Design a protein around this motif. Structure first.
Motif, PDB file in Angstrom:
ATOM      1  N   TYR J 236       0.838  -1.189   0.000  1.00 18.72           N
ATOM      2  CA  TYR J 236       0.000   0.000   0.000  1.00 18.72           C
ATOM      3  C   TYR J 236       0.877   1.244   0.000  1.00 18.72           C
ATOM      4  O   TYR J 236       2.032   1.216   0.426  1.00 18.72           O
ATOM      5  N   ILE J 238       1.846   4.373   1.539  1.00 20.36           N
ATOM      6  CA  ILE J 238       1.754   5.047   2.829  1.00 20.36           C
ATOM      7  C   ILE J 238       1.740   6.564   2.648  1.00 20.36           C
ATOM      8  O   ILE J 238       1.157   7.288   3.463  1.00 20.36           O
ATOM      9  N   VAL J 239       2.349   7.064   1.570  1.00 22.38           N
ATOM     10  CA  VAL J 239       2.346   8.502   1.303  1.00 22.38           C
ATOM     11  C   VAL J 239       0.937   8.983   0.978  1.00 22.38           C
ATOM     12  O   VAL J 239       0.500  10.036   1.459  1.00 22.38           O
ATOM     13  N   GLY J 243      -1.293  11.534   3.146  1.00 24.18           N
ATOM     14  CA  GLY J 243      -1.900  12.713   2.548  1.00 24.18           C
ATOM     15  C   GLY J 243      -3.385  12.806   2.837  1.00 24.18           C
ATOM     16  O   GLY J 243      -3.898  13.880   3.174  1.00 24.18           O
ATOM     17  N   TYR J 244      -4.085  11.670   2.743  1.00 21.80           N
ATOM     18  CA  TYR J 244      -5.502  11.634   3.095  1.00 21.80           C
ATOM     19  C   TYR J 244      -5.712  12.020   4.552  1.00 21.80           C
ATOM     20  O   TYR J 244      -6.536  12.888   4.859  1.00 21.80           O
ATOM     21  N   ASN J 256       3.762  10.302   9.505  1.00 20.73           N
ATOM     22  CA  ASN J 256       4.544   9.993   8.317  1.00 20.73           C
ATOM     23  C   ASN J 256       5.463   8.797   8.527  1.00 20.73           C
ATOM     24  O   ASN J 256       5.951   8.227   7.545  1.00 20.73           O
ATOM     25  N   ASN J 257       5.690   8.398   9.774  1.00 21.94           N
ATOM     26  CA  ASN J 257       6.556   7.276  10.113  1.00 21.94           C
ATOM     27  C   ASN J 257       5.685   6.073  10.458  1.00 21.94           C
ATOM     28  O   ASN J 257       4.899   6.126  11.408  1.00 21.94           O
TER      29      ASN J 257
END
Ligand SMILES: CCCCCCCCCCCCCCCCCC(=O)OC[C@H](CO[C@@H]1O[C@H](CO[C@H]2O[C@H](CO)[C@H](O)[C@H](O)[C@H]2O)[C@H](O)[C@H](O)[C@H]1O)OC(=O)CCCCCCCCCCCCCCCCC
Ligand SMILES: CCCCCCCCCCCCCCCCCC(=O)OC[C@H](CO[C@@H]1O[C@H](CO[C@H]2O[C@H](CO)[C@H](O)[C@H](O)[C@H]2O)[C@H](O)[C@H](O)[C@H]1O)OC(=O)CCCCCCCCCCCCCCCCC
Ligand code: CLA
Ligand code: CLA
Ligand code: CLA
Ligand code: CLA
Ligand SMILES: CCCCCCCCCCCCCCCC(=O)OC[C@H](COP(=O)(O)OC[C@@H](O)CO)OC(=O)CCCCCCCCCCCCCCC
Ligand SMILES: CC1=C(/C=C/C(C)=C/C=C/C(C)=C/C=C/C=C(C)/C=C/C=C(C)/C=C/C2=C(C)CCCC2(C)C)C(C)(C)CCC1
Ligand SMILES: CC1=C(/C=C/C(C)=C/C=C/C(C)=C/C=C/C=C(C)/C=C/C=C(C)/C=C/C2=C(C)CCCC2(C)C)C(C)(C)CCC1
Ligand SMILES: CC1=C(/C=C/C(C)=C/C=C/C(C)=C/C=C/C=C(C)/C=C/C=C(C)/C=C/C2=C(C)CCCC2(C)C)C(C)(C)CCC1
Ligand SMILES: CC1=C(/C=C/C(C)=C/C=C/C(C)=C/C=C/C=C(C)/C=C/C=C(C)/C=C/C2=C(C)CCCC2(C)C)C(C)(C)CCC1
Ligand SMILES: CCCCCCCCCCCCO[C@@H]1O[C@H](CO)[C@@H](O[C@H]2O[C@H](CO)[C@@H](O)[C@H](O)[C@H]2O)[C@H](O)[C@H]1O
Ligand SMILES: [Cl-]
Ligand SMILES: [Fe+2]
Lengths: 341, 28, 61, 35, 37, 436, 33, 28, 81, 324
Positions: J236, J238-239, J243-244, J256-257
């Motif tokens: 998937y 992850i970025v 963002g969502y 973000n981690n």
């Protein structure tokens, strides 16, 4: 390009707080629900609807403040400020419980707006809208408990009041009057919530303890890059560990994360169905076979019969004060006591 | 400019004294 | 003797405040360390003497 | 009752001794990376 | 009660046991001074 | 400086004390400053408790936990736990506060100004965690110090005024113990007793002779073991059984401290000998039995049963508390249980006063310190000190069990070399055969 | 850098009544009861 | 008030040690 | 990111402090005067500590009719007056 | 080699279908004994005089119970905290009548579950894993210890332990609320925050990962077939998920981690359940929840009730009915 197109470009502009078309519904309604709750718990009494003090101004603390439900004689009135009960007077509107209906209705439309926001952001970002699907379960809980349950009952009075101790009263009320723990739909709700907590803990711990060594530091958090293409933890090792510990293990990561979606959402939906049943007093209060057996045998005692006796105690000792409109006067000899059973 | 740690400490002390005021009012 | 003991105890409180502020400051300042070390030795001797004086004056008050 | 008690004591002693002497039998060496 | 000659330092004693807790807070303050490096 | 950031040390700020693992001087400074914190709390809390102590009122009605500890040592108390002078409490608090200033000075010096590593300066104080002989030598020194502390308690009990004996006739008194129990059969029969109801393990010690004799044994054993560890090196089975690293030794100490915390909460909940009810208040069983006895006195001017083992005990729910033994109840206890006619015509006014006072102060309360049942008004502000000590030490013991698990697992993983994660090119499971 | 942003509006609609309410609650703490 | 002022002085002891070491630059 | 000034740069700005050292005390004073002068009791209809019960009665003033609840509340307030 | 060598190599073998280990050589017999005794007692145990006043409570299926109302009744109040094995009773009838099976099951289960935690550590060590899954498991284990051991120790009888049944569990909850006001205890409130947040974050993480799955399949095929077991690439984006979620609340409320996010997922319900287990233990030593009775008094001295007073009325109603 047309006022609609220019407004649409403005609403979906990238900024700190996304607005969107759904923001026009969400931000006013959510702001009014939160502000009404804070205003009611800070200033507004429940003296005329419940005979209770429920604000900081009266001397209550954070655990005991609430925006209480309207009086039972209001029925299921919308209790609008301009309606026939308050007749435009803000003070009488607050005294009659109009803040409760204010918060409930604006919170319902705010929940609608937040779910529409989830859909809108999923559309612009380009992801599947499964977060909105998952958020359908809190909406189902809110609609079943704060709207459908009082609508099935006599008035808004028997809905939960927006407060900590008031919610605790709602829990004890459902135990005493509905035997809500005996309801299998609530049982599936409990299984969904506790299984979701278990899945959260177990998945987080499993990922954190199957991490690949991707950095030289002893703190592994900096060893992750968001733009990396490789998996940060070993799914093979995790599968082997849980296969040998528990017997079974996830082997598909996508199925794992769908299962994490599925368990608490299904639990909350089942509990909402049970709450609809309780809205019509269609409770799982008793087992008829055990009632007949207890009637025909004085020595028969199970934990279920003891729970029925505890429910009777809850009802008789809490009803005169929790339901002041009924004018329940229970003399001391009719109150159930263990020393008379 | 003002250092960020100064601002963080001042905000923490202010939130601590408002919590202490609320607890003092609770015990009173 | 009562006001003398009270003054000595207040002086002990003030000197303990001075040492508590100053000793980590002097320990973590390498540039001015020599006079700092001399003042720390003087303050430690004064603090020990003030503690003993407060004890014996407590027995007298 | 006494025969059952002696049997349970023997069984528990056997399993506890298995645990203790197994963890004394070079347990840190039984890892995939070092030793 | 305390001995009477110490009574004028009775408020100070009233705040003495809370001092170790502040030590914990002081560590975070120190880290805030160094940017949590 | 060196090892004071993430890039050089590998540990983030929230694990920043882990940067002290191989810095012996700074680690010693942290330890000495922390010991100063402990002694500071002891002194400051003693002075705070004394500043709000009414000596006429019982200690357990005023929320005190440190003044009862000094009072149990036979300092400042007389018969019946009455406070005859509050000055030794002040002495204990003041000396602890001053010693904490000294320890804080030493901790700050070794942490900030002193040598970062002790190895080059001194071979005696310089230590490496892998050096097993040096570890056992330091352990031996500390064992000798602990044995000296146990013998200091013995010397206080035998030579320097004695201890408060709640079992002294007449209602308890400060007594000098002259004949401690040196017999190893009693001392280690306390160790071999069951931890369950009616037996209670070492918590069931009910006389100060056993306490002082056990402390003589503990002091001598600790001194002997300290000498043994100074003179010897770890054997081969010991070297192959343990992980030899600083985190491993920390994890062993954490497991030991967790067990000690559970033992301490059981001691403060059940034992009324080393935690006398004059100072700490009645135990829960003590309060229930006192209620039964006082209501028997009231109804006689019926609470009797037979027990599973055939013994006269108080009836009702307090049948669960029939193993309770207290100094106000033991004179009324015959060889078959409670002697009923001895209750009728041998009751003493001090026993009745104790029973009524312990009726009114059952270990029952709330978090906002409201006394009585949870369904009653806030008319009385009381939570028993036994409840506070037991609850706090259960919480600490459980969290130290968690810390022991964390550090033992981390020490094993770091010794074996995969505490930072799985090597991508040498993942062990991939080389393993599939389970099916 | 503009000032009258959407972020400013959200922050201040949550911030101004917060301080008004906090002053109200402190004045409540000094009620004689 | 005396308790509050004592709390204030002891509470500014530590952060101003940090302030003095930061301004008069040393090994914090 | 997004074109807004960072929060850290805002809160560390001296100008932010000089604006917010006046407005925040003004709002705090406004709320304190709202409660202390007793305007909150009149605005929200919350009874004062001596206004829960009438001088003669000890009956809790529940409203019992849907369309006469306003008049009922007013009657209770007149009987306490 | 030696028979002890072969036995040690078999016990610690990672090639066994289920790992045994030394914690497992304790865990398997104790859990098997507890399971067998629980099934037999749940089906066929005679009534148990739990209060020691000869009014026994029937918990087994054969004596007129269903799945919901069936329980293994806790041991008798006359037993108290006394150790009650089979050989301590005069007969099997007396052992069953005083609730001995409850003691056998709970002691074996607590031993086996502690060794289950140790076995989790052991297998993590043999596979070269990081060792802290057992730390996460320590929260439900602490809860089991609190309701089966610590609460009986504080109250002075194993008769106050939680029954091994569904309706018995509800009875335990209601009597506990009557005696301790657990709902007003902040440790139970932390536990509720832990389980509610755990369910929330479980649904949230699942929905965000499912939302950002990379297209690897057709519309007819299930998307789960897009992932291969042991594939190296992430399944998937992850970025996109970050963002969502950053646009859903704001950019700094989003992880973000992935390692930080999964640590948070582990830490929130584990810490909450730790606090609720400690709450049960601290109420076992009768340090109860917030009372707040009669907290609002008018000028004339009349008590103005709050919601806490309604709670106290309900608690009194439970209290008068559970006694005698
Ligand atoms: C490595 C470790 C090895 C372990 C492997 C298994 C070995 C045995 C385990 C023991 C478990 C304890 C169970 C019962 C404990 C209990 O009834 O505890 C109470 C007893 C005390 O017993 C009581 O002791 C009393 C003693 O007082 C007597 O004597 C007094 C003298 O002053 C008074 O006079 C008093 O009135 C009088 O009655 C009475 O005898 C009572 O009847 C009796 O019940 O404590 C004691 O024995 C002492 C302390 C017990 C330890 C506490 C257990 C902690 C468990 C939780 C851990 C968390 C897990 C989390 C995982 C995630
Ligand atoms: C939003 C909220 C959350 C915010 C985030 C931060 C998390 C922590 C928040 C803590 C807030 C504390 C509020 C400060 C006021 C306070 O507490 O103030 C209360 C007391 C001080 O007040 C005194 O409290 C006393 C309490 O009674 C005690 O003393 C009485 C007589 O003095 C009686 O004898 C009575 O029996 C005895 O219990 C009386 O009310 C006194 O009159 C009164 O002066 O503070 C004390 O003690 C101070 C406590 C020091 C440490 C105590 C260690 C004990 C830990 C137990 C662990 C077990 C788990 C417990 C369950 C949870
Ligand atoms: C009991 C608590 C305790 C103790 C004793 C220590 C001790 C220590 N920590 Mg530490 N730490 C703690 C809690 C504690 N920590 C907590 C809770 C955290 C999490 C925030 C950290 C995070 C942390 C990090 C991230 C690091 C340390 C480091 C260190 C070491 C060097 C300190 C240094 O150079 O600072 C210098 C700081 C100053 C000079 C500022 C002033 C501090 C002084 C000493 C305060 C004294 C005040 C006192 C009132 C004085 C009384 C004196 C009087 C008796 C005369 C030192 C041994 C460092 C290390 O490992 O070094 C290699 C390091 O990098 N710690
Ligand atoms: C004698 C006891 C002892 C000692 C010496 C250590 C030592 C250490 N631990 Mg450890 N630990 C202990 C007990 C102990 N632990 C216990 C009992 C637990 C279980 C909770 C843990 C859980 C634990 C974890 C999970 C980790 C460590 C880590 C570490 C290392 C770095 C610690 C650090 O910088 O913390 C800095 C200190 C802080 C950030 C402060 C934490 C704040 C606490 C949790 C809250 C305090 C609440 C307080 C009681 C009440 C409120 C206070 C008020 C001001 C609000 C260090 C070797 C780390 C490690 O493995 O590194 C190798 C690590 O990740 N420990
Ligand atoms: C566990 C505690 C401990 C340990 C292991 C050390 C260890 C050390 N310290 Mg240190 N120190 C401590 C506590 C400790 N200190 C305290 C509390 C203070 C404040 C007073 C100091 C102040 C201090 C200074 C100012 C200096 C050291 C130095 C040293 C080093 C050389 C000392 C030497 O040669 O002694 C040789 C042995 C002796 C002198 C005999 C000491 C006998 C003691 C004082 C009697 C104590 C009796 C009894 C055990 C007390 C129990 C107290 C307890 C109950 C709290 C050495 C690494 C020196 C250093 O770093 O060198 C560069 C140095 O300059 N220390
Ligand atoms: C702080 C205390 C302390 C510590 C940490 C150590 C540490 C150590 N000692 Mg030691 N020792 C001490 C005090 C201490 N000692 C004292 C006071 C004495 C004098 C009696 C000794 C006498 C001594 C000898 C004679 C030997 C050691 C050895 C050892 C090493 C091996 C440890 C080991 O495998 O035992 C782990 C424990 C066992 C294997 C015992 C069996 C486990 C049983 C089943 C546990 C039962 C307890 C249970 C939990 C219930 C508790 C209650 C119970 C009493 C009923 C280790 C370095 C050995 C060594 O290598 O010498 C250098 C050795 O031969 N010690
Ligand atoms: C990726 C970094 C963080 C990882 C861990 C995050 C864990 C979760 C913690 C969440 C809380 C703390 C946030 C991090 C905190 C953090 O990282 O600190 C730093 C960050 C500010 O940093 P900057 O100055 O870089 O941000 C300003 C930007 O605009 C850049 O110009 O703080 C905030 O975002 C302030 C939060 C209050 C803002 C209040 C706005 C309210 C308006 C209304 C919002 C409505 C939204 C809902 C709509 C329905
Ligand atoms: C109803 C109504 C309305 C509305 C209004 C509004 C909208 C308001 C708002 C309001 C608001 C908006 C308010 C606010 C408030 C706030 C507050 C009051 C706060 C508090 C806080 C605190 C107290 C804190 C806490 C904490 C936390 C949580 C964490 C950490 C710790 C602490 C504790 C610090 C209108 C007129 C339109 C119309 C008519 C009706
Ligand atoms: C005995 C005594 C004394 C001594 C004392 C001492 C020893 C002290 C110390 C003190 C100290 C040592 C203090 C400290 C304090 C601290 C503080 C006050 C802090 C706080 C903090 C905060 C507020 C924080 C915040 C934050 C941050 C920064 C980050 C994160 C976030 C937060 C927000 C949390 C004297 C000499 C006076 C005199 C005599 C008596
Ligand atoms: C390394 C480090 C650390 C730590 C530190 C520490 C922990 C320290 C300690 C400290 C200490 C441990 C201190 C102590 C002090 C004390 C003092 C300084 C005292 C003095 C005293 C006095 C002056 C007395 C007075 C009096 C008397 C005579 C009696 C009556 C009352 C009165 C109070 C008035 C931290 C974490 C920050 C972080 C980073 C670094
Ligand atoms: C003072 C006193 C007393 C006395 C006491 C005594 C005499 C004690 C001793 C004690 C002792 C003498 C103890 C011991 C302990 C031990 C232990 C606790 C052990 C542990 C162990 C371990 C931990 C091991 C482990 C292992 C295993 C199992 C296998 C392999 C691996 C290892 C090595 C890890 C009395 C009560 C009389 C009275 C009161 C007071
Ligand atoms: C409840 C009572 C318990 C009493 C325990 C006290 C005993 C203390 C000393 C025990 C000595 C055991 O010592 C240990 O034994 C085993 C089995 O014999 C020896 O032999 C072992 O060698 C290697 C070590 O890697 C293992 O792989 C192998 O399985 C085993 O044969 C160890 O080399 C020795 O370290
Ligand atoms: Cl019941
Ligand atoms: Fe995941």
């Amino acid at each position: 390009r047309g006022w609609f197109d220019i407004l649409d470009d403005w609403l979906k502009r990238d900024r700190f707080v996304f607005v969107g078309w759904s923001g026009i519904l969400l931000f006013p309604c959510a702001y009014l629900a939160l502000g009404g709750w804070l205003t009611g718990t800070t200033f507004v009494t429940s003296w005329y609807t419940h005979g209770l003090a429920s604000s900081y101004l009266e001397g209550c603390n954070f655990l005991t403040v609430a925006v209480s439900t309207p009086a039972n004689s209001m029925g299921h009135s919308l209790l609008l400020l301009w309606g026939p009960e308050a007749q435009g007077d803000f003070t009488r509107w607050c005294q009659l419980g109009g803040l409760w209906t204010f918060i409930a209705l604006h919170g319902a439309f705010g929940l609608i707006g937040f779910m529409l926001r989830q859909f809108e952001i999923a559309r612009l970002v380009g992801v599947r809208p499964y977060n909105a699907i998952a958020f359908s379960a809190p909406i189902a809980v809110f609609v079943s408990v704060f709207l459908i349950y009082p609508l099935g009952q006599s008035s808004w009075f028997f809905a939960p009041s927006f407060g900590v101790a008031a919610i605790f009263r709602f829990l004890l009320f459902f135990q005493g009057f509905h035997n809500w723990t005996l309801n299998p739909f609530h049982m599936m709700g409990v299984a969904g919530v506790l299984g979701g907590a278990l899945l959260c803990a177990i998945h987080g711990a499993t990922v954190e303890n199957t991490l690949f060594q991707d950095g030289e530091g002893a703190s592994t958090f900096r060893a992750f890059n968001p733009t990396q293409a490789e998996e940060t933890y070993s799914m093979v090792t995790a599968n082997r560990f849980w296969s040998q510990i528990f017997g079974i293990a996830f082997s598909n990561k996508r199925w794992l994360h769908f299962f994490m979606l599925f368990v608490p959402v299904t639990g909350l939906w089942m509990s909402a169905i049970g709450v609809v049943g309780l809205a019509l007093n269609l409770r799982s209060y008793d087992f008829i076979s055990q009632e007949i057996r207890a009637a025909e045998d004085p020595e028969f005692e199970t934990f279920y019969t003891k729970n029925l006796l505890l429910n009777e105690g809850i009802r008789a000792w809490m009803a005169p004060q929790d339901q002041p409109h009924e004018n329940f006067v229970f003399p001391e000899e009719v109150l159930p006591r263990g020393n008379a059973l | 400019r003002i250092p960020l740690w100064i601002v963080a400490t001042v905000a923490g002390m202010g939130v601590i004294v408002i919590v202490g005021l609320f607890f003092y009012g609770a015990y009173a | 003797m009562t006001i003398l003991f009270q003054l000595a105890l207040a002086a002990l409180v003030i000197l303990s405040f001075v040492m508590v502020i100053g000793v980590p400051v002097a320990y973590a300042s390498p540039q001015d360390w020599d006079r700092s070390k001399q003042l720390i030795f003087l303050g430690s001797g004064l603090w020990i003497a003030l503690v003993l004086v407060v004890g014996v004056l407590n027995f007298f008050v | 009752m006494e025969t059952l008690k002696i049997t349970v004591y023997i069984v528990v002693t056997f399993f506890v001794l298995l645990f203790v002497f197994g963890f004394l039998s070079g347990d840190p060496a039984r890892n995939p990376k070092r030793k | 009660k305390l001995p009477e000659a110490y009574a004028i330092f009775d408020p100070l004693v009233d705040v003495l046991p809370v001092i170790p807790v502040l030590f914990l807070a002081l560590a975070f303050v120190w880290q805030a001074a160094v940017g949590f490096r | 400086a060196t090892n004071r950031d993430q890039e050089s040390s590998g540990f983030a700020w929230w694990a920043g004390n882990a940067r002290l693992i191989n810095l012996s001087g700074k680690l010693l400074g942290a330890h000495v400053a922390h010991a100063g914190l402990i002694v500071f709390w002891a002194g400051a809390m003693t002075l705070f408790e004394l500043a709000h102590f009414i000596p006429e009122k019982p200690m357990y009605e005023q929320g005190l936990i440190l003044i009862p500890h000094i009072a149990t040592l036979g300092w400042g108390v007389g018969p019946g736990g009455e406070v005859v002078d509050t000055f030794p409490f002040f002495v204990v608090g003041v000396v602890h506060l001053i010693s904490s200033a000294v320890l804080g000075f030493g901790g700050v010096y070794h942490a900030i100004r002193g040598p970062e590593t002790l190895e080059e300066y001194s071979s005696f104080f310089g230590y490496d965690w892998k050096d097993k002989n040096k570890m056992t030598t330091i352990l031996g020194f500390h064992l000798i110090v602990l044995g000296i502390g146990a013998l200091l308690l013995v010397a206080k009990a035998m030579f320097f005024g004695g201890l408060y004996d709640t079992w002294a006739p007449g209602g308890g008194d400060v007594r000098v113990i002259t004949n401690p129990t040196l017999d190893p059969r009693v001392i280690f029969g306390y160790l071999l007793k069951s931890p369950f109801g009616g037996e209670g393990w070492i918590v069931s010690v009910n006389n100060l002779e056993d306490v002082v004799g056990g402390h003589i044994w503990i002091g001598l054993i600790c001194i002997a073991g300290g000498i043994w560890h100074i003179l010897t090196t770890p054997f081969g089975w010991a070297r192959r059984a343990f992980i030899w690293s600083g985190e491993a030794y920390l994890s062993y100490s954490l497991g030991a401290l967790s067990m000690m915390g559970f033992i301490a909460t059981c001691f403060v909940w059940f034992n009324n000998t080393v935690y006398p009810s004059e100072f700490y208040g009645p135990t829960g069983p003590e309060a229930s039995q006192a209620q039964a006895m006082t209501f028997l006195i009231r109804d006689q001017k019926k609470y009797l049963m037979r027990s599973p083992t055939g013994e006269i005990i108080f009836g009702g729910e307090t049948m669960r508390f029939w193993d309770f033994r207290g100094p106000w109840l033991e004179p009324l206890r015959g060889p078959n249980g409670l002697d009923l006619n001895k209750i009728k015509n041998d009751i003493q006014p001090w026993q009745e006063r104790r029973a009524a006072e312990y009726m009114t102060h059952a270990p029952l309360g709330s978090l906002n310190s409201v006394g009585g049942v949870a369904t009653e008004i806030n008319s009385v502000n009381f939570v028993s000190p036994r409840s506070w000590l037991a609850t706090s030490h259960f919480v600490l013991a459980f969290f130290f069990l968690v810390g022991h698990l964390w550090h033992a697992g981390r020490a094993r993983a770091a010794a074996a070399g995969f505490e930072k994660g799985i090597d991508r090119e040498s993942e062990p499971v991939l080389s393993m055969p599939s389970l099916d | 850098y503009p000032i009258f942003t959407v972020r400013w509006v959200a922050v201040h609609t949550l911030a101004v009544p917060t301080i008004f309410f906090l002053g109200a609650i402190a004045a409540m703490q000094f009620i004689q009861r | 008030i005396a308790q509050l002022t004592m709390i204030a002085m002891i509470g500014i002891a530590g952060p101003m040690i940090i302030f003095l070491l930061a301004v008069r630059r040393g090994n914090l | 990111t997004t074109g807004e000034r960072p929060f850290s740069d805002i809160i560390t700005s001296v100008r932010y402090w000089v604006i917010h050292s006046i407005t925040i005390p003004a709002l705090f004073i406004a709320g304190w005067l709202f409660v202390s002068t007793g305007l909150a009791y009149d605005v929200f209809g919350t009874p004062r500590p001596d206004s829960y019960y009438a001088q003669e009665q000890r009956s809790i003033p529940l409203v019992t009719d849907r369309f006469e609840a306003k008049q009922q509340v007013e009657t209770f307030l007149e009987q306490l007056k | 080699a030696n028979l002890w060598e072969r036995f040690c190599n078999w016990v610690t073998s990672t090639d066994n279908r289920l790992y045994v280990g030394w914690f497992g050589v304790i865990m398997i017999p104790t859990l098997l004994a507890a399971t067998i005794c629980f099934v037999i007692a749940f089906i066929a145990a005679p009534p148990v005089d739990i209060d020691g006043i000869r009014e026994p409570v029937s918990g087994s299926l054969l004596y007129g119970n269903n799945i919901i109302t069936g329980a293994v009744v806790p041991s008798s109040n006359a037993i108290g905290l006394h150790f009650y094995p089979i050989w301590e009773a005069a007969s099997l009838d007396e052992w069953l009548y005083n609730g001995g099976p409850y003691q056998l099951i709970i002691f074996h289960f607590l031993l086996g579950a502690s060794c289950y935690m140790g076995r989790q550590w052991e297998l993590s060590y043999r596979l070269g894993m990081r060792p802290w899954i057992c730390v996460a498991y320590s929260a439900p284990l602490a809860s089991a210890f609190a309701v089966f051991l610590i609460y009986p120790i504080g109250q002075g009888s194993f008769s106050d332990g939680m029954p091994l049944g569904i309706s018995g569990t509800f009875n335990f909850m209601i009597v506990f609320q009557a005696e301790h006001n657990i709902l007003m205890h902040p440790f139970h409130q932390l536990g509720v925050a832990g389980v509610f947040g755990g369910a929330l974050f479980c649904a949230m993480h699942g929905s965000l990962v499912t939302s950002s799955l990379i297209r690897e399949t057709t519309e007819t095929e299930s998307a789960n077939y897009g992932y291969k077991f042991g594939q190296e690439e992430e399944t998937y984006n992850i970025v996109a998920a970050h963002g969502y979620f950053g646009r859903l609340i704001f950019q700094y409320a989003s992880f973000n981690n992935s390692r930080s996010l999964h640590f948070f997922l582990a830490a929130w319900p584990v810490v909450g359940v730790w606090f609720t287990a400690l709450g049960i233990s601290t109420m076992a030593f009768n340090l109860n929840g917030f009372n707040f009775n009669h907290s609002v008094i008018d000028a004339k001295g009349n008590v103005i009730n709050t919601w806490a007073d309604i709670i106290n009325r309900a608690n009194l109603g439970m209290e008068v009915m559970h006694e005698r």
